[PDB]
Structure formats: C-alpha cells, structure tokens
Amino acid sequence: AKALIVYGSTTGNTEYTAETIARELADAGYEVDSRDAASVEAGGLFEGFDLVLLGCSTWGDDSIELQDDFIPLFDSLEETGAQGRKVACFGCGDSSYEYFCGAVDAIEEKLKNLGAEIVQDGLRIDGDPRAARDDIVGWAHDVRGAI
Numbered sequence: 001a002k003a004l005i006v007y008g009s010t011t012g013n014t015e016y017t018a019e020t021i022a023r024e025l026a027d028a029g030y031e032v033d034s035r036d037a038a039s040v041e042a043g044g045l046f047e048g049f050d051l052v053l054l055g056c057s058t059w060g061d062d063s064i065e066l067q068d069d070f071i072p073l074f075d076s077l078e079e080t081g082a083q084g085r086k087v088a089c090f091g092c093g094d095s096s097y098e099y100f101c102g103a104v105d106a107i108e109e110k111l112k113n114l115g116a117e118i119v120q121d122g123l124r125i126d127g128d129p130r131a132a133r134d135d136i137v138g139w140a141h142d143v144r145g146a147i
C-alpha cells in the first residue's frame with residue numbers, strides 16, 4: 001500500500017512525528033509520500049492513497065488555531081476527496097493548555113462530516129515528540145493492523 005503524510009510544523013515537532021511515523025510505514029512495505037503542508041495543494045490531493053496521514057500542532061491561548069502552514073489545507077479539505085478515505089490524524093501540543101491538541105480534534109471532525117473513515121483515534125503528543133517516540137511507533141503500528 002500507498003500512504004500520504006501531510007504535516008504542519010512551526011517549531012519542528014510535528015515534522016519529527018511525521019518522520020517517525022513515515023519509516024514506521026516504510027519499513028513495513030509501505031510506499032510513502034511525505035509532505036509539508038506549507039507546499040501542498042488541495043486539488044484532489046488524497047487521490048490514489050490507501051491511507052492519509054494528516055498532522056498539525058496547536059496554537060492560540062483563548063481560541064484554537066492550527067499550525068499556520070496547515071490552515072489553507074484545513075480550509076480546502078472537502079476539495080481533496082476524503083470520501084470513504086482512510087485517514088488518521090496526529091500532532092503535538094502541551095496539556096498545560098485547556099484544549100490540548102485541539103487541532104487534532106478539528107481535523108478529525110471535518111474529516112467525518114466529510115466522509116473519511118478514521119481508522120484510529122488521533123495521536124495527541126504532550127511534549128517533545130522525541131521522548132514519546134515509542135507512543136509514536138505503536139500508533140503508526142496500530143493504524144497498519146487497522147486498514
């Protein structure tokens with residue numbers, strides 16, 4: 001199978017996560033196309049993938065904001081065809097906050113209402129993804145034995 005990894009990272013956390021996740025896949029027999037959202041384009045993007053990996057960090061204090069690079073993709077997500085698509089969402093945040101990884105929640109929601117089938121519960125990392133690296137290896141892993 002063929003997977004798409006699209007990520008929004010500001011400080012490099014979600015970028016790290018998507019890489020760990022990328023290999024996760026690739027070492028398993030997976031063909032993987034990883035991309036920065038900063039550059040993606042919504043026009044049938046999801047097209048011809050068996051799984052879509054959609055990542056993003058949270059910003060904001062009062063209001064939930066999505067990693068910046070990712071917003072314009074968030075905005076035009078019904079243009080990508082996530083109909084009966086297989087999508088799992090991930091990102092980084094800090095639980096010191098009230099709407100911890102609230103960016104994972106919104107992603108997942110527009111996905112549903114859109115058509116995707118979420119194969120698994122979003123992976124919400126609290127901290128440097130790097131020290132949770134195992135939590136990560138297992139999630140990539142649970143989404144495989146899931147399709």
Ligand SMILES: Cc1cc2nc3c(=O)[nH]c(=O)nc-3n(C[C@@H](O)[C@@H](O)[C@H](O)COP(=O)(O)O)c2cc1C
Binds near residue numbers: 010057098
């Ligand atoms: C201005 C700001 C507000 C944040 N907003 C929240 C929050 O609402 N939810 C939470 O999960 N993460 C929140 N975080 C921090 C995480 O989003 C951020 O540290 C994270 O690691 C993103 O890594 P990245 O560079 O891949 O986007 C806050 C941190 C700061 C700087």
